Amino acid sequence: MDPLGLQDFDLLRVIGRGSYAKVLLVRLKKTDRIYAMKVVKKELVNDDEDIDWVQTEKHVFEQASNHPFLVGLHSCFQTESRLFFVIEYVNGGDLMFHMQRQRKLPEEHARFYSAEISLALNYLHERGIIYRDLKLDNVLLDSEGHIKLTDYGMCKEGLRPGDTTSTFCGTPNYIAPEILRGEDYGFSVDWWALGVLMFEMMAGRSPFDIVGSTEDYLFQVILEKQIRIPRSLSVKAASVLKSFLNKDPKERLGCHPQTGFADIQGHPFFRNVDWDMMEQKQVVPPFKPNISGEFGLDNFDSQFTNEPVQLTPDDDDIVRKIDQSEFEGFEYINPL
């Protein structure tokens, strides 16, 4: 009855890869339960600002509680060369793959996703966290069609309501003008990002897609150009998109220090949302992901699921240079 380690898991598939991490499907042998497992090589995160950043992701994971629309953390452990986050396995695909197939979503569908994402973001903000990386491929669908925000590597944590931070930060298409103007910023930047994502879901293109007809020109467009709402969108959609995409983060829907989230809930576009049923996952999703074969691996990129299910052998030369002391106390098991 020692604490969990690597030997406690079967490795089942490779499901993902980002800048700094490899993601596997795993099974905890003891309990026969399935999780995703995010694997980070210590040699990537052994410096100054790395340690802090690994800690942030770890803390956001914990706060991500068992909130229904955030990816939760089962456990952490380490080996010599690696850190491991055992996390919820979420297998419905993501909203990028979704948009690429559906092309353009009905307003009702985009309302459902937006409402669930709003609940996730608000819960984060209420916990002192700025997400900072809201974009289509960071919004996963679970097997039933509910959303889950993922990838907390860009987050800011520990923030008091109405305190601000200043790291220039994010994915260009989604970056909020405040950030581009060099200003100190709060939770406002997430609500801007929601606006862009909503525009993407209902229009099936970016509001900034004139760029290409100069990623620094993208930035100029975001700062300087008035967004045009497609004629096909309802008046209520134009209104919510316009309010979310206010360049002035003080006037922006969702951004009032006191009433921000209540302003979102009370917006005419969200009129038919029962936010209590939504939060309890009592609203039936508009689209049910197809789960093929054993684990639904078909919703993941074949680039990853094709890989050999293994952890790359290390070279002991690099590994021995790691100061192991700075990962003391990494181990964690959820308190449920």
Layout of helices and strands:
Elements: E1 9-17, E2 21-28, E3 33-41, H1 48-63, E4 73-78, E5 82-87, H2 95-102, H3 107-126, E6 139-141, E7 147-149, H4 177-180, H5 188-203, H6 215-224, H7 235-244, H8 260-265, H9 275-279, H10 302-305, H11 316-319, E8 332-333
Antiparallel strand pairs: 1-2, 2-3, 3-5, 4-5, 4-8, 6-7
Helix pairs in contact: 3-5, 5-7
Describe this structure in words.
Keywords: Acetylation, ATP-binding, Cytoplasm, Endosome, Kinase, Membrane, Metal-binding, Nucleotide-binding, Nucleus, Phosphoprotein, Proto-oncogene, Serine/threonine-protein kinase, Transferase, Tumor suppressor, Zinc, Zinc-finger. By secondary structure, the chain is α+β, with helices and mostly antiparallel strands. The chain has two domains: 1-93 and 291-331, Phosphorylase Kinase, domain 1, CATH 3.30.200; 94-290, Orthogonal Bundle (Transferase(Phosphotransferase), domain 1), CATH 1.10.510.10. It has eleven helices and eight strands. It has helices at residues 48-63, 95-102, 107-126, 177-180, 188-203, 215-224, 235-244, 260-265, 275-279, 302-305, 316-319, and strands at residues 9-17, 21-28, 33-41, 73-78, 82-87, 139-141, 147-149, 332-333. The strands form two sheets. It has a six-stranded antiparallel beta sheet with strand order 1-2-3-5-4-8, with helices on one face. The longest helix is centred in the middle third of the chain and has 20 residues, at 107-126.
